[PDB]
Design a protein around this nucleic acid. Structure first.
Ligand code: MG
Ligand code: MG
Ligand code: MG
Ligand code: MG
Ligand code: MG
Ligand code: MG
Ligand code: MG
Ligand code: MG
Ligand code: ZN
Lengths: 129, 96, 209, 199, 81
RNA sequence: GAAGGCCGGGGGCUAGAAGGCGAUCAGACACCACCGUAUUCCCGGCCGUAAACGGUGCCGCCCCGCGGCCGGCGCGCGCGUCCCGCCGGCCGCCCAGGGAAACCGGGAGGCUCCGGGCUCUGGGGGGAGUAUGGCCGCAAGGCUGAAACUUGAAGGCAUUG
RNA sequence: GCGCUGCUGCAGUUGAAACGCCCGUAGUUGGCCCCCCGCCGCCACGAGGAAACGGGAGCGCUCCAGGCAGGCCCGUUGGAC
């Protein structure tokens, strides 16, 4: 059965980008997907998207502009100490200069740089670059 | 390794198929793996048909035929030149 | 006698119309003449090494027929590396063919900084991977002063390519030299085809060339 | 734009007619399928494609670097006339592999543009072109494979009437763009020449 | 454009980005090509010698679809309707 | 839960383990010819194994293109069991991609750029699916399942002769 | 060494390895949605509680392995954390 909506959405997006399309559809419209897409948009990877209501798990449309190379999830949400982030950074991202790791905290959804600035930790959702 | 995608038979959407017997050795073979040819021929061969017609009395008498189905196993078909061993590229051709 | 170019690129190179090899790489033109690379390297700055020499046999009606295969690399220790192979009945001609082929194909190696940006680049831009046969290679950026953490054979390639600090990981049957060198070569070749955000800037094309 | 003389020449040339089969990459150029099964193209779309291709061709300064390949015995005359009046190059007949990558071949050249009448008979050269950074333009029927095809011209490529007309129109347009012939006056050359005349 | 601590660039050269997929073109992408399209005078029939230039990567070319991408690009940069 | 096999009753034409007999052979108690018991068929009940194979676990998402067949539905017309689509199923070829390769491509893809959920199995070759225990079974046997000792290769796909 | 015990991070068509198939309990896993209330986990800070070892500030046992000294006009000389 369907479980991780975010994983299916990200996989569809990456497959569409690989053949250089411009528009995609994603059945689920969860809040977590919305925040993930908001962070992607603000950082400049996917530009625009819209949510299409239907009373039955609304659909969402997104636009592509290249740039994005990879994006995934971590299926069991680990717990990330505020001081234990460099190991995950090195293990997951290609370089320390660019890339964004998404953590969900008591202060909301943010990136590993922001949490490192506030010296707090939490749970990890995914990554992209 | 695998030599043929069909595994040497025509078996789709089933588990078991009825069996038959080879006509020259009487071996038991699955119906989807045996080699089949349909033939139609005259009872009297072609050289004596004219003599048969001249000796016949009925006017417009038509020579009756023979309708038979021959079934052979893999070993006997090869030994009697019913099929030929083909090259690796030519195994994928499916015309008569 | 003299070098009579057999190609439009060769003629343009003989003339002083083209001024840098980077001016060639930017448009992905195939190279067929070995004279083109010495013109840009008049003083023979490029190095050379012979990684391996193996003998291959073919069974025949009467005994065996033997042959020799050789692998060669070349680089100037500054962002340029090439790999090539050659096979012949005699060792020396095989080596000459391998050297010619290695010189023929050449690629630039992109380099970057680990954390602090001070001075010239000292390591690879980011994570790079290559695949040839069963062997896989991973190149990881490293801090300054870390040296080259790799086997002697791979370290030779990274030295001839002009790197100073890097971590490496290997997998598969690494005892097969050709495929290890090929995997590292492919990883290095991929370096300049990897998009990074600083290259997101939108540049209009140029009609000339 | 499209003029009555051109459309009438086309419909009497059976240029708008295609083939029973269709491809998902060529449905934009289709207007309707006849009851029998034959597909029908759009004349406006093909005319616009011809104009665009003519622009791309004239963008090349030296016409001698433009390649024309036609293994079809029907097109030989049209391609020869095309190169004669357009000062281009011809490779009629069999295409020797290595004509673009093997510098020791007697007929070795470094073209900048390649023209084809049908990939199925000429896609052997298309691969060669892909090896040497060469854009390609082709005449494509209703069903075709776009493998290294950059620009396609939807039209029938079997009947001589169709082939000669298309080449003649392309020559006319490129000449007009170059500035030799103004649009108002009809071109001195007739399409009947490009068509192979038996005996 | 990778800058140093002083903001000076240090990258050897900036390669090309495909006009359609915004993807980098490698030094060995031998199937990558670049074209140009002519601009036309107000009277027409004549060319101003200003050519808008495009480049498509090898992967998209093998995948097909270059034609439609070219059409949309032209309509974006040209009133070719 | 195939076939074979077992217990108790029926029935008894074909073929046919065992057995016998004639050839062939150096020998031939085997291949070939002939006769022929159990069995093969029915009822009730045990056994619980097969190359029980797609040698590919179940649920779920995205995915180049072409074509055939089966069932149901709908659309259009010039009404033909026409052609244009939808769902589900069985198939063939194949671009990318993957792989040691043969090859897969309705995944063996989206994976060293290496994290959707659940279950089971394996860790060089022999000894050995053996010994000793336990359970099931009328029995034949099935499930579970070592060690000592020995050994430097055994294997997979492909190339030339 | 060993990504040959694999959580990170193995393999399971052909090399060793998907139970013959179905049902099914413990067990594991479970679509979307409510703007602020209580509870569990979770993250951060804090208290409290032995030193040595380990990390680590300062001190030229002639250096060092070490030790907590030592200088004159020493933070209340110091031995912090
Ligand atoms: Mg065999
Ligand atoms: Mg079966
Ligand atoms: Mg039985
Ligand atoms: Mg099995
Ligand atoms: Mg893994
Ligand atoms: Mg193992
Ligand atoms: Mg063992
Ligand atoms: Mg096995
Ligand atoms: Zn028989």
């Amino acid at each position: 059965v369907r479980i991780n909506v975010l994983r299916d959405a990200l996989k569809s997006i990456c497959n569409a980008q690989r053949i250089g399309k411009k528009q995609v559809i994603v059945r689920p419209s969860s809040k977590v997907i919305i925040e993930f897409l908001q962070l992607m948009q603000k950082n400049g990877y996917i530009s625009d998207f819209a949510v299409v209501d239907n009373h039955r798990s609304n659909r969402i449309v997104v636009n592509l502009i290249g740039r994005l190379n990879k994006a995934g999830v971590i299926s069991p949400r680990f717990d990330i100490p505020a001081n234990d982030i460099e190991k995950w950074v090195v293990n997951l991202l290609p370089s320390r200069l660019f890339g964004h790791i998404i953590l969900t905290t008591s202060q909301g959804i943010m990136d590993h740089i922001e949490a490192q600035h506030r010296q707090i930790g939490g749970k990890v959702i995914g990554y992209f670059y | 390794p695998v030599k043929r995608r069909n595994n040497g038979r025509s078996k789709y959407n089933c588990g078991h198929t009825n069996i038959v017997r080879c006509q020259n050795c009487h071996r038991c073979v699955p119906k989807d793996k045996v080699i089949k040819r349909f033939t139609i021929r005259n009872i009297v061969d072609n050289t004596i048909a004219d003599d048969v017609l001249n000796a016949c009395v009925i006017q417009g008498f038509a020579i009756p035929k023979l309708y038979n189905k021959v079934q052979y196993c893999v070993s006997c078909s090869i030994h009697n030149h019913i099929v030929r061993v083909r090259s690796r590229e030519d195994r994928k051709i499916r015309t008569p | 006698e003299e070098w009579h170019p057999s190609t439009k690129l060769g003629r343009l190179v003989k003339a002083g119309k083209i001024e840098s090899l980077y001016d060639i790489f930017k448009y992905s033109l195939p190279i067929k003449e070995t004279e083109i690379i010495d013109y840009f390297f008049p003083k023979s700055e490029l190095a050379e090494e012979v990684c391996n020499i193996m003998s291959v046999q073919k069974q025949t009606t009467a005994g065996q027929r033997t042959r020799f295969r050789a692998h060669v690399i070349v680089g100037n220790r500054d962002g340029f590396i090439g790999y090539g192979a050659g096979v012949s009945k005699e060792v020396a001609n095989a080596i000459k063919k391998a050297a010619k082929n290695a010189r023929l194909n050449i690629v630039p190696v992109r380099r970057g900084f680990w954390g602090g940006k001070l001075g010239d680049p000292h390591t690879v831009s980011s994570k790079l991977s290559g695949k040839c046969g069963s062997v896989r290679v991973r190149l990881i950026p490293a801090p300054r002063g870390a040296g080259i953490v790799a086997s002697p054979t791979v370290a030779k390639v990274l030295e001839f390519a002009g790197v100073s600090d890097v971590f490496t990981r290997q997998s598969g049957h690494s005892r097969t030299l050709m495929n290890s060198v090929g995997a590292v070569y492919n990883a290095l070749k991929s370096s300049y085809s990897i998009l990074t955000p600083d290259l997101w800037k939108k540049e209009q094309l140029d009609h000339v060339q | 734009q499209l003029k009555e003389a051109d459309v009438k020449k086309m419909l009497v040339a059976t240029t708008h007619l295609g083939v029973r089969n269709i491809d998902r990459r060529m449905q934009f150029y289709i207007f309707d399928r006849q009851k029998d099964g034959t597909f029908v193209f759009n004349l406006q779309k093909v005319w616009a494609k011809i104009v665009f291709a003519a622009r791309i061709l004239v963008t090349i300064d030296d016409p001698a670097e433009i390649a024309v390949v036609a293994n079809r015995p029907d097109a030989q005359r049209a391609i020869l006339k095309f190169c004669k009046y357009t000062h281009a190059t011809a490779f009629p007949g069999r295409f020797i592999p290595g004509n673009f990558t093997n510098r020791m071949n007697p007929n070795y050249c470094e073209p900048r543009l390649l023209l084809v009448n049908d990939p199925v008979v000429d896609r052997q050269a298309i691969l060669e072109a892909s090896y040497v950074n060469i854009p390609t333009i082709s005449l494509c029927n209703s069903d075709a494979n776009l493998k290294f095809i950059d620009v396609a011209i939807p039209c029938n490529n079997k009947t001589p009437m169709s082939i000669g007309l298309i080449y003649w129109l392309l020559a006319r347009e490129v000449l007009r763009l170059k500035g030799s012939i103004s649009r108002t006056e009809e071109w001195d050359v007739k399409p009947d020449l490009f068509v192979a005349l038996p005996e | 454009g990778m800058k140093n601590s002083s903001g000076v660039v240090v990258d050897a050269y900036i390669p090309r980005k495909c006009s359609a997929t915004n993807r980098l073109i490698g030094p060995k992408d031998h199937a990558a090509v670049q074209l140009s399209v002519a601009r036309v005078n107000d009277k027409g029939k004549m060319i101003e010698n200003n050519y808008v230039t495009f480049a498509f990567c090898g992967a998209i070319r093998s995948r097909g679809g270059v034609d439609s991408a070219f059409m949309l690009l032209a309509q974006e940069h040209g009133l070719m309707e």
